[PDB]
Enzyme design. Structure first.
Site, PDB file in Angstrom:
ATOM      1  N   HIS A  35     -52.363 -64.742  33.265  1.00 21.04           N
ATOM      2  CA  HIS A  35     -53.154 -65.274  31.860  1.00 21.04           C
ATOM      3  C   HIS A  35     -52.828 -66.155  31.184  1.00 21.04           C
ATOM      4  CE1 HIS A  35     -52.395 -61.562  28.597  1.00 21.04           C
ATOM      5  NE2 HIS A  35     -52.464 -61.088  29.796  1.00 21.04           N
ATOM      6  N   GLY A  74     -48.892 -61.060  22.554  1.00 21.28           N
ATOM      7  CA  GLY A  74     -47.229 -61.370  23.011  1.00 21.28           C
ATOM      8  C   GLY A  74     -47.023 -60.721  23.723  1.00 21.28           C
ATOM      9  N   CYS A  78     -47.482 -59.384  26.981  1.00 20.39           N
ATOM     10  CA  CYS A  78     -47.944 -59.807  27.893  1.00 20.39           C
ATOM     11  C   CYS A  78     -46.593 -60.123  28.663  1.00 20.39           C
ATOM     12  CB  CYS A  78     -49.203 -60.602  27.918  1.00 20.39           C
ATOM     13  SG  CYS A  78     -50.935 -59.592  27.414  1.00 20.39           S
TER      14      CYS A  78
END
Ligand SMILES: O=C(O)C[C@H]1C(=O)O[C@H]2[C@@H]3OC(=O)c4cc(O)c(O)c(O)c4-c4c(cc(O)c(O)c4O)C(=O)OC[C@H]2O[C@@H](OC(=O)c2cc(O)c(O)c(O)c2)[C@@H]3OC(=O)c2cc(O)c(O)c3c2[C@H]1[C@@H](O)C(=O)O3
Ligand SMILES: O=C(O)C[C@H]1C(=O)O[C@H]2[C@@H]3OC(=O)c4cc(O)c(O)c(O)c4-c4c(cc(O)c(O)c4O)C(=O)OC[C@H]2O[C@@H](OC(=O)c2cc(O)c(O)c(O)c2)[C@@H]3OC(=O)c2cc(O)c(O)c3c2[C@H]1[C@@H](O)C(=O)O3
Lengths: 304, 304
Positions: free
Chosen positions: B41, B143, B145
């Site tokens: 993503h 952030g 991830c």
């Protein structure tokens, strides 16, 4: 979201950990440039630890009597100096992994990360606080001495702790990297015992703010208190006094949450007086005091 | 002595963390050899996340559309592949700091360390467990991830988790490094919600053993129980069933402490039925389930 007891990334400290052997005693050392810093009691046996005469054990120690291993590589000890309770072993090689670093003496209530090491090898990293009684509640087995505590600011490793002693109560005592013990502790066994510890109030308040930030708000009451009245309560529960400096330090968390510090204090007062009635805050059923306001801010922001 | 939630030393993972930017979306990536693994993503905006068509966003993404930064150095993305929910970005440089590593898919109840990173920079390290509901209770801000979870065995980093999603309940979901999500989670917002979590019984028992090893023994009762009877109680308190495999895994801790697992189970049963009456165990007022038997053994031994 979420809030965890987070340690600093340990890589920059891992690269400084070495094994220091003096005779049968093997502990950890911190290799920064061409010096390895380690607890002076590396020159002690367990039997020597009751009341060791360190400059006696050391004066009968040569540079060659100190064996420093970094990974699978031996560093020659080409000098030895005792500074307070730390041995500074001048070694023949400067550590290429010496990060930018500083030696700092932290204040009680401040937190740091410990890289627990045995035989110069990092085993784990965890965060802890310098307790008000200048102990740390760490996890240290025999051979972890010389494990260090640190904080990282950007590129700078601030080493603030070196592990030297487990007190008979099972808490831990150590020094700064200048070898000055935190607290009244000494690197000898003795009736030496930890003084009474207290709860770090400003950290509890910070963590309550962390809780609010993370949505755990149930303990927020509708009251406020004065600083003086809160401190009267704090005192009764063996909480450190909250100073205006603490209040000011919590300002950013107050600003973020909208909860005036004295309002949070009122909430904490009620938690202290009434307990948590089986509830948790940030997954804890106790009030947590090992997060400073700065830890909370850092963790709730993306500070890398 | 002492027992702390300890993470693995993070250095070998820190050296693999990079920043992956695709458009305005910046997340973390794991740089191992010449591949950077990151959540797919990264190609999504926050608006894309409701129901993203990933091979649609990706098919309109070029290799050049992926910007990978390692420290202050840009790696050219010279290939991009989607594997499940992870993007494998072939980069022009193999990471010189690629440790020996493995990708493992952990089981619920197993613990690992997370190196929380933002913008490719490590912020902190903490240990956590894969919950039975396949979430993790981490500390992840926007952030983070692509932050990974790992375990270290000697020289080998076993990456078992990559952070992809914060669920609306504030717990975290992610994948293994093959991009297969743990649990029924998907990298899209949806009524997607965490299923009911349970307490990791075998870990609670391990931690009780850790408590005994560290001298916190007050909860030890004089009874024993059968596995079946314990499981009936376990069930009522939303504790996972204890299997004979768990019992056997706890064998070493039983051996060390002399406390048969079923005796510890009886003690845990009583803790579950009666609570802790304001006492703590290993400084916790709740039963802790994020220490596996192996964590306890490692921490109580000097495993580096
Ligand atoms: O970058 C990485 O990913 C890791 C990589 C690394 O950091 O390199 C830095 C680091 O030193 C500083 O950061 C530094 C020190 C200062 O004293 C100072 O004043 C500084 O300004 C800086 C600095 C720098 C850059 C910045 O952007 C920044 O912000 C800084 O602050 C900078 O150029 O530093 C040099 C470099 O080399 C090493 O230092 C010396 O060689 C040195 C030290 C002395 O004390 C001394 O007297 C002497 O003569 C030489 C240090 O190496 C490690 O610390 C290290 C540790 C590990 O555990 C690893 O695994 C590891 C490394 C390095 C490498 O070996 C690897 O591949 O991995
Ligand atoms: O030693 C230190 O203190 C840190 C230092 C380091 O570890 O070096 C190792 C490490 O790789 C392995 O360990 C390894 C990998 C395997 O795949 C494998 O099969 C192995 O047997 C081993 C291995 C080794 C030695 C052992 O004793 C042991 O037990 C092992 O398991 C060994 O020789 O490894 C090579 C060496 O170099 C790097 O790997 C490659 O170059 C490589 C990787 C590939 O995947 C690949 O395909 C390829 O062609 C090349 C890796 O570097 C880092 O991982 C690193 C990470 C950081 O974060 C740092 O800060 C950092 C470093 C290195 C250095 O750069 C520094 O100064 O600091």
């Amino acid at each position: 979201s979420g809030f965890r007891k987070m340690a600093f990334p340990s890589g920059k400290v891992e690269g400084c950990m070495v094994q220091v052997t003096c005779g049968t005693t093997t502990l950890n050392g911190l290799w920064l440039d061409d010096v390895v810093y380690c607890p002076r009691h590396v020159i002690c046996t367990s039997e020597d630890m009751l009341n060791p005469n360190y400059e006696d054990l050391l004066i009968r120690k040569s540079n060659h009597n100190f064996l420093v291993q970094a990974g699978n590589v031996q560093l020659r000890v080409i000098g030895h100096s005792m500074q307070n309770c730390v041995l500074k072993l001048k070694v023949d090689t400067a550590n290429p992994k010496t990060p930018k670093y500083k030696f700092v003496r932290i204040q009680p209530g401040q937190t740091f990360s410990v890289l627990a090491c045995y035989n110069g090898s990092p085993s784990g990293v965890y965060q802890c606080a310098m307790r008000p009684n200048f102990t740390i509640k760490g996890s240290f087995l025999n051979g972890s001495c010389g494990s260090v505590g640190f904080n990282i600011d950007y590129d700078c490793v601030s080493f603030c702790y070196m592990h030297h002693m487990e007190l008979p109560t099972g808490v831990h005592a150590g020094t700064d990297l200048e070898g000055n013990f935190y607290g009244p502790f000494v690197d000898r066994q003795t009736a030496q015992a930890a003084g009474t510890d207290t709860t770090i109030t400003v950290n509890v308040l910070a963590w309550l703010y962390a809780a609010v930030i993370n949505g755990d708000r149930w303990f927020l009451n509708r009251f406020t208190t004065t600083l003086n009245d809160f401190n009267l309560v704090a005192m009764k529960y063996n909480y450190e006094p909250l100073t205006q400096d603490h209040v000011d330090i919590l300002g950013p968390l107050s600003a973020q949450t909208g909860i005036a510090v004295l309002d949070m204090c009122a909430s904490l007062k009620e938690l202290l007086q009434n307990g948590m009635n089986g509830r948790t805050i940030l997954g804890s059923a106790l009030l947590e005091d090992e997060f400073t306001p700065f830890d909370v801010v850092r963790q709730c922001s993306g500070v890398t």
